[PDB]
Amino acid sequence: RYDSRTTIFSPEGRLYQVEYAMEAIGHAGTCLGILANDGVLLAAERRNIHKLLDEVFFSEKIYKLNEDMACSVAGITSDANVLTNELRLIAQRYLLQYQEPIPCEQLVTALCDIKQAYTQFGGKRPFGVSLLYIGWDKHYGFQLYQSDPSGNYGGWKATCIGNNSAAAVSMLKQDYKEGEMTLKSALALAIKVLNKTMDVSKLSAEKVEIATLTRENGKTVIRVLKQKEVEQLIKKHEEEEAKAERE
Amino acid sequence: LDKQIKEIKEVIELPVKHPELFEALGIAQPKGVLLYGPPGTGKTLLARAVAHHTDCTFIRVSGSELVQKFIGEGARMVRELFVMAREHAPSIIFMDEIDSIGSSSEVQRTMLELLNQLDGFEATKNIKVIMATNRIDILDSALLRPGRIDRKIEFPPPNEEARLDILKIHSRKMNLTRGINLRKIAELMPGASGAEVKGVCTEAGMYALRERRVHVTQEDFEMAVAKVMQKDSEKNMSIK
Amino acid sequence: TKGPDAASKLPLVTPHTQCRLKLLKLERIKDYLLMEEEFIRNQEQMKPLEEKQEEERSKVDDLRGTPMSVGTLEEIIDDNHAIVSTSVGSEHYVSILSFVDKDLLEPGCSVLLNHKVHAVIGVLMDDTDPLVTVMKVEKAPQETYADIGGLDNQIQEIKESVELPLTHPEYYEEMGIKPPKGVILYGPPGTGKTLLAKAVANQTSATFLRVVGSELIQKYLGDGPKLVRELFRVAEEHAPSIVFIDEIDAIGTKRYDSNSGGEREIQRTMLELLNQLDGFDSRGDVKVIMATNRIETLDPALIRPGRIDRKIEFPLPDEKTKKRIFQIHTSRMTLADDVTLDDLIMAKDDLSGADIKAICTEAGLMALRERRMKVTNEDFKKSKENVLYKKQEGTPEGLYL
Amino acid sequence: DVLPPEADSSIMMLTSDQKPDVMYADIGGMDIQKQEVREAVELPLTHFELYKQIGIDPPRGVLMYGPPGCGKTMLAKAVAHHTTAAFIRVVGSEFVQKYLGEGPRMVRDVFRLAKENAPAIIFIDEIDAIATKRFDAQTGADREVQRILLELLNQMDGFDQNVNVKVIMATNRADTLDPALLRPGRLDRKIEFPLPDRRQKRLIFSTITSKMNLSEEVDLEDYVARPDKISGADINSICQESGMLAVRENRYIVLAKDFEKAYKTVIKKDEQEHEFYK
Amino acid sequence: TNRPDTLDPALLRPGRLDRKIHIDLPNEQARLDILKIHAGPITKHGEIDYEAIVKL
Ligand SMILES: Nc1ncnc2c1ncn2[C@@H]1O[C@H](COP(=O)(O)OP(=O)(O)OP(=O)(O)O)[C@@H](O)[C@H]1O
Ligand SMILES: Nc1ncnc2c1ncn2[C@@H]1O[C@H](COP(=O)(O)OP(=O)(O)OP(=O)(O)O)[C@@H](O)[C@H]1O
Ligand SMILES: Nc1ncnc2c1ncn2[C@@H]1O[C@H](COP(=O)(O)OP(=O)(O)O)[C@@H](O)[C@H]1O
C-alpha cells in the first residue's frame, strides 16, 4: 500500500520499507555479545553447515575492523561486505588524519549515518544488515554497541541480534550480573545461551564461533578461539549440566 | 493436555449444570470458547470427546458453510439454525471451519448476521459455542471480542512427556514385544504433531505386516520414525 | 396508530442485595399478580349473561363459510360487484354484502371472500408480512442507563436526539427546530453501541423496532426492497417509534459498480432504503438509529444530513470512564479490600468495556478455581494476563522513535 | 411401500460398468508402487481380519508423486479394473461460479454409496490448483478456492464417518500442498513415481510390445541400455509412431528402421532453445 | 482447427493427435485456379484475363 518507495510516509508516520528491513533481519544467523569487564566476547552460530563446504577462511561472521575493534554482522551478505569495507576505510581515514585510533562510538555513528542517508533518498533501498561492535579505547574502556538497519544504534552490556533474539535477551536479562562477569563467567553464560537458543543439540563445536577482545601490556588482543578451546568450554558446560541433575 | 480439558470443562459444563454457583458469584457466565492450534493437533478430537459426554443437544456444522452458494437464501446458516438450537434449551454448536465465514465480499454478510445473533440485544443464553481453526489472527476482530468469544485455548505441540503419553494411548492394542523403549521413541521424535504419533504407530504396524509377523520391534519403530519425518534442502539460497 | 412495549415489571429492587426489603418488595409484586390472575379467573365467572345466550353473530357465522379465502380488491363497483383476484390471478367480479361494513374499500388492500361463491366475507384483513411483525418487541431487556457508565456526552447526544423530542417539544416548537432524525453510532468493536441501544430500548415510551443489517438478502430477485418499504410503512403506522439497524455495513458499502457482473442487487436495496429514509414525500414521525463497526466504508450517499443527522463516536475508555465501567461491573459481586481496581486501570491501556466484563468474569472463575468465593488482587493479576493474550501487534518501532 | 433407492455415483456404480480394463501385470515396472498402493487400498477393502488382528486402523489416504507421464492415471485405472468397491472418481476440477464447495456434496454421496453397497475409493490428479497456502483472506473471489480446500480437509478428516473410504491424490510436486492436507491421519502414504530407469524401460517395452508384429530384427536392448531419460508416455508414443510409420509405407510388420525413426522423432527436447540460457 | 490458441502437449503426443498439417501458402496460382472454379457458375463474355485479375 504505502510501500515500494523508501521515501513515502504512511498516513501514521511509518516508513514501512525500513520496518520490513528490520523484520527481515530475523532471517539471519544468531549472533550475540557480552561486555564482561576486563574483556569482551562475541559469539555466533555458523549456520548452513554442509559436508562439502571447505571453510578455508578465518571466521565468517567476525571481522577485524581495526587493530582495536571488531564487529559481527547479520543480514544480506553483499551488504555485509560493503559495510565492513566501509568501516575499515573510515577507521583508517581517521587514523591518518589524527594519528590516533578511532573511538568506537565515532565509527559506529559514521556508519549509522551512512545507513540513515540510504533510508533518506528514494534512489536506493535501505541496508538490510544489523551488526554488533566490540572494542576498547582510552575514553571509555571497553564498549559494546549495536546498530540496526534503520540507522539507530545503542550501547549494551550484553545482547543478541539475529534469529531467536527474544529468548536470548530474556535469558541474559534474567541471568547476567553487572560488573562481575570477569570473562570466564561470560563465556559460560554465552555457551548456555547458545545451547538453549540454537536448535541443534550438543552444540557441535563447528556450529559456534567465538572471539574475545582483551587488553595486555597496553595493547589490545583480539583472538578467535580455535576448536580445542571451544571443545573444552562445551565439555565443561555439559559436565555442569550433568552435575545439576538429581540436585 | 489436561489443562485444556479442564478449561473447556469449566467453561462448558459448569454454566449449564451449576448456574447457582455463577449467580451467587454475581458474574455473567461465559459463552464463547476458541480452539486454535498452529498444527491443529487434537483440536476437534477434543471436540468429539466433549460431544460424547455432551448431555445436551450437540449441534455441528463443518461443511465449509453448507448451502452458502448461489441465491435461494442469504445467510441461511443463522436465524433458523439458532432458533432450532435454542428450541433444545441446553445445547452447544460446533463450527469446525472458523476460517471461512469471516476474515475481514458477499460472504461476510452472513458472518455479520452471525455476530449480531450471537451478540446481545435480545439474545438469550443457555447456548454455548466452540470454534476450531488455525491462525486465529486472520479471524475478524469482531469475532475475537471478549463478549462473543470468552476463552482462547492454544494446542501447542506435545512435549516429550505428552508425546510418550499419546504414544502409549495409541499403542494399547499394539502387541509390543519385551524390549521396546517408548521413552527413546518419544525422545528421538521432537516437534511431534500428535497425529504423527498415531501415524508412526500405524506405519510400524504396516512394516510388521509386510514381514507377516504379529510383533513390532524397536528397530521397526525407529524405521517408522524415519519414514514419518520428511526433510527438505536446496543450496545457493543459503545467504543472509 | 398503535402503542408500544409493555414490560417494566417494577424496576425498583433497589437494595440489590440480600435484604428483607427485597423480600418484602417482591412479595408485594407477587400479591398484585396473583390477584390480577384471580381478577380474570372470576371476571368471566360473574354475570352468566354470556352475550345474551347469543344473537347477531349467528348471521355472520352462517353467511360466511368456515374457510375464508383472500385476494386483492380491484376496481370497485357500487353494485357490490368489485373485482377481486385470488392468489392465482383468478380475477372475478363478484358481489360483496352480508352484515359487512362497506367503508374500508381501497385498491390493493387484502380482502376476504368465500371459498365457494367467492363473495366478499367482510373482515378486510389488517395484517402485514410476518417477516416484520416478528421484529416487533415489547420486552425491555435490562436497566436503562445505570448499568452503562461514563458515556455522558454520548448518552446526552442520544437523549437529545430521541428521548427529549417525545417528552417536551416546547423548546422545539417555540424555536421552530425540527429534532434530528438519524443517528449513526460507530466505534471499535465492543465499545458498547449495542449496550446503549438496549439501554434506550428499556426506557423508550414508543414502540421499538429491531433489525439486523444482513436481513434484506431475500433470495428471489427483486422482492427485497419491498421488505424494507413495508417495514417503514409499518413503523410509521404504529405511532411514533424508533427503528434500530445493527451492523449497517452490510447493505450499503461505497456503492461500487457491479465489476464482475454478479449483480448482487443489494445496491438496489440500499438505494430503496435511502429513498425511503429521505427522498420526496415526507418520512413522518419516525426516528432512526444505526450501529456499525466501520463507518468510513459506508458510501457517502447514505451518510448525509437529513438521513443521519448525528455521527456519534464511541472511543476506548481511558481512565475515568474505564474506572466507571470497572467498578460498575464489580459492584454486583463480592470483592476483597486488598483489591485495587485503579491499579489495574492505570496498568493497562487500550481496554474496552467488553474486556472489562470478560476480565471480571474470568477473575471470578479463577477464584472459584481456587475454591474461594472471595476474590483477591492476585486473582485479577492472573485474569488480566489470561484475557489479554490474543492481542499481539507492534512493528519493530522500539528503537527508532 | 417405500420405493428402492435412486440416484447414482458419477455416471453409475464404479463410474458406470465401464471398467478401465487394465491388468497389473498388463502394466509392469512399478512393482514397488503397485505393492504399496495395493497394501493401502485392496487389503483393507478385502479381508482386513489380519489388520484387526494387528489392530492397525488401516490408512485411508495415499498420494503418488512423479513427473507428468511416469505411470499414474493408468495405475488408478488398473485399480478400478481389479477392485470390488464402488469407485466413483467423478472429480472433474470444478471452479464453478454458482455451486461452490461440492466436496461434501460428493464425499457424503460416496459415503452414502459406501454404506449403500460397500466402501468406495476416490482418485484424482491435477488437484494442485486447490492446494494453495491461504495467505491473504480479504481479496474477494480469491478466497473461494481456500474455502473449497477447507471444506475438503474437513470432509476428509471430519468425523468418525469412516467406512474405509480411501482417497488417492495424483497431483504432485508437493510444495503448494497445505500441511493441513499433508500429515499422518491426513493423506498418509506418500509414494514416489520416478522416471522409468534402466531395467524398467525394458519391462515397459516388453509389456507394450507384447501384442505386436515384432519384425524380429529390432533389438529392444539397444534402447533399454541406451542413455537419455524417457517417461512411459513417451515410450508408448514411440511405439505408436513406429507403428504408424510402418503402416504409412504399407508395411504390415513394423521393421527396425521404423522403430529408429520413431525414437528419433519422439526425442525433441526443447526443440527451440535460444542458444542462450545454455 | 487453428482456432484453439492453447495447444495441449498431451494431445500432440503421438497417438491422440497423430500429425499436424499446415495449411499451404497460396502461390497466386492456386488463386487463379480458385477464381476459375468460382468463375464457373458465373455468366460472362468469356474474354476474362484471369491472370490479370489475380495480379490486380
Ligand atoms: N495427542 C493426541 N491425542 C489424541 N488424538 C491425537 C493426538 N495427536 C494427534 N491426534 C489425532 O489427530 C486427529 C485430531 O483431529 P482434530 O479434530 O484435532 O483435527 P483438526 O483440528 O482438523 O487438525 P489435525 O488434523 O491437525 O488434528 C485425530 O485423528 C486424533 O486422534
Ligand atoms: N462502558 C461500558 N459500561 C458498561 N457495559 C459496557 C461498557 N462497554 C461495554 N459494555 C458491555 O460489554 C458489551 C460489549 O460491547 P457490545 O457487545 O455492545 O459491542 P459493540 O461492538 O459496541 O456492539 P455490537 O455488538 O452491536 O457490534 C456491551 O454490549 C455491554 O454489555
Ligand atoms: N504399465 C505401464 N508401464 C509403463 N508406462 C505405462 C504403463 N501404462 C501406461 N503407461 C504410459 O504412461 C501413461 C500412464 O499415465 P501417466 O502419463 O503417468 O499419467 P499423468 O502423466 O497424467 O499423471 C500411459 O498413458 C502411457 O503413456
By the 8 A CB rule, do B151 and B34 touch? yes
Looking only at the bridges linking them, the beta strands covering A129-137 and A141-147 are antiparallel
Q: Which helix (H) or strand (E) holds A16?
A: helix A16-24
Pocket test for ligand 2, best of B116, B117, B119 (most atoms within 8 A of CB): B119
Taking the C-alpha atoms of residue B163 and residue B186, their distance in angstroms, rounded to an integer, is 6
Q: Which residues of D touch B138 (CB under 8 A)?
A: 134, 137
Which amino acid is residue D267, in one-letter code? I
> Residues B84-108, buried b or exposed e (16+ Cβ, 10 A)?
ebbeeeebbbbbbbbbbbbbbeebb
Query: What contacts E46, CB < 8 A, 6 or more positions away?
Result: none
SS3 at position E25: coil
By the 8 A CB rule, do A35 and A142 touch? yes
By the 8 A CB rule, do A213 and A70 touch? yes
Q: Which helix (H) or strand (E) holds A147?
A: strand A141-147
Find residue C313's DSSP bridge partners. C186
Chain C CB within 8 Å of residue B81 CB: no
Closest CA to A213 of A205, A203, A225: A225
Q: Give the CA radius of gyration of chain D.
A: 22
Residues 39 through 78 of chain D touching chain B, CB cutoff 8 Å: 39, 50-51, 53-59
Task: Please report, for residues A63, A91, A133, E4, E35, the alpha-carbon distance to residue A69 in angstroms, rounded to integers and kept in the order given.
Answer: 9, 10, 7, 69, 92
Question: What strands lie across the sheet with C310-313, from one edge to the other?
Answer: C207-212, C241-246, C287-292, C182-186, C310-313
Taking the C-alpha atoms of residue B44 and residue B42, their distance in angstroms, rounded to an integer, is 6
Task: Please report, for residues A44, A59, A117, C287, the alpha-carbon distance to residue A73 in angstroms, rounded to integers and kept in the order given.
Answer: 9, 12, 20, 66
Q: What are phi and psi of C75, to 5 degrees?
A: -35, 130
> Which residue ranges form the domains of chain A, and what is each CATH number?
1-246 (3.60.20.10)
Taking the C-alpha atoms of residue C220 and residue C218, their distance in angstroms, rounded to an integer, is 6
> Residues C248-280, buried b or exposed e (16+ Cβ, 10 A)?
bbbbbbeeeeeeeeeebbbbebbbbbbebbbee
What dihedral angle (degrees, nearest 10) is formed by the CA atoms of C30, C31, C33, C36?
170
Closest CA to D225 of D199, D203, D205: D199
Confirm or reject: Cβ of D119 under 6 Å from ligand 3. Answer: no
HEC states along chain C?
CCCCCCCCCCCCCCCCCCCHHHHHHHHHHHHHHHHHHHHHHCCCCCCCCCCCCCCCHHHHHHHCCCCEEEEEECCCCCCCCCEEECCCCCCEECCCCCCCCCCCCCCCCEEEEECCCCCECCCCCCCCCHHHHCCCECCCCCCCCCCCCCCHHHHHHHHHHHHCCCCCCHHHHHHCCCCCCEEEEECCCCCCHHHHHHHHHHCCCCEEEEEECCCCCCCCCCCCHHHHHHHHHHHHHCCCEEEEEECCCCCCCCCCCCCCCCCCCHHHHHHHHHHHHCCCCCCCCCEEEEEECCCCCCCCCCCCCCCCCEEEECCCCCCHHHHHHHHHHHHCCCCCCCCCHHHHHHHCCCCCHHHHHHHHHHHHHHHHHCCCCCCCHHHHHHHHHHHCCCCCCCCCCCCCC
CA-nearest residue for atom 6, ligand 2, is C353
SS3 at position D72: coil
Query: What contacts C208, CB < 8 A, 6 or more positions away?
Result: C4, C5, C137, C201, C241, C242, C244
Q: Given the C-alpha cell 432458533, which residue does it identify? A: B83
Chain B CB within 8 Å of residue C371 CB: no
List the grid coordinates of B119: 451478540
Neighbour-count burial of B66, counting CB atoms closer than 10 A to its CB (0-12 exposed, 13-18 middle, 19+ buried): middle
HEC states along C369-389?
HCCCCCCCHHHHHHHHHHHCC
Taking the C-alpha atoms of residue B150 and residue B30, their distance in angstroms, rounded to an integer, is 6
Q: Give the CA radius of gyration of chain E.
A: 19
Taking the C-alpha atoms of residue A76 and residue A82, their distance in angstroms, rounded to an integer, is 10
Neighbour-count burial of A116, counting CB atoms closer than 10 A to its CB (0-12 exposed, 13-18 middle, 19+ buried): middle
Taking the C-alpha atoms of residue C176 and residue C357, their distance in angstroms, rounded to an integer, is 44
CA-nearest residue for atom 10, ligand 2, is C353
Q: Output DSSP code: residue E22.
A: P
- Residue A105 burial (CB count, 10 A): 17
Closest CA to C111 of C122, C100, C98: C122
Q: What are phi and psi of D218, to 5 degrees?
A: -85, 125
CA E17 to chain centre: 22
Crossing angle of the two packed helices B195-210 and B160-170, in degrees rounded to 10? 50
Taking the C-alpha atoms of residue A214 and residue D271, their distance in angstroms, rounded to an integer, is 66
Taking the C-alpha atoms of residue A177 and residue A155, their distance in angstroms, rounded to an integer, is 16
CA B143 to chain centre: 18
End-to-end CA distance of chain E: 30
Angle at C233 between CA C227 and CA C235, to 5 degrees: 100
Q: Which residue of B has its CA nearest to D191?
A: B227
Closest partner residue to B21 among C218, C220, C368, by Cβ? C368
Which amino acid is residue C20, in one-letter code? R
List the grid coordinates of D267: 526425442
End-to-end CA distance of chain B: 38
Closest CA to C82 of C120, C52, C50, C115: C120
CA-nearest residue for atom 10, ligand 3, is D232
Taking the C-alpha atoms of residue D65 and residue B131, their distance in angstroms, rounded to an integer, is 34
Looking only at the bridges linking them, the beta strands covering B32-36 and B127-133 are parallel
Crossing angle of the two packed helices D31-45 and D73-81, in degrees rounded to 10? 40
Taking the C-alpha atoms of residue B60 and residue B96, their distance in angstroms, rounded to an integer, is 8
Quick check: E15 and D266 CB within 8 A?
no
Closest CA to A155 of A109, A210, A91: A109
Confirm or reject: Cβ of B120 under 6 Å from ligand 2. Answer: yes
Closest CA to D29 of D81, D62, D78: D78
Q: Output DSSP code: residue D186.
A: B
CA D212 to chain centre: 26
Taking the C-alpha atoms of residue D273 and residue C55, their distance in angstroms, rounded to an integer, is 105
Taking the C-alpha atoms of residue C241 and residue C284, their distance in angstroms, rounded to an integer, is 11
Closest CA to B118 of B146, B151, B90: B146
Query: What is chain B's length?
Result: 240
By the 8 A CB rule, do D225 and D201 touch? no
Taking the C-alpha atoms of residue B149 and residue B129, their distance in angstroms, rounded to an integer, is 8
SS3 at position E42: coil
By the 8 A CB rule, do B175 and B215 touch? yes
Q: What's the gap in Å between B40 CA and the centre of ligand 1?
A: 7
Taking the C-alpha atoms of residue A219 and residue C59, their distance in angstroms, rounded to an integer, is 125
Q: Which residue of D has its CA nearest to B68?
A: D100
Looking only at the bridges linking them, the beta strands covering B127-133 and B91-95 are parallel
Closest CA to A147 of A164, A163, A159: A159
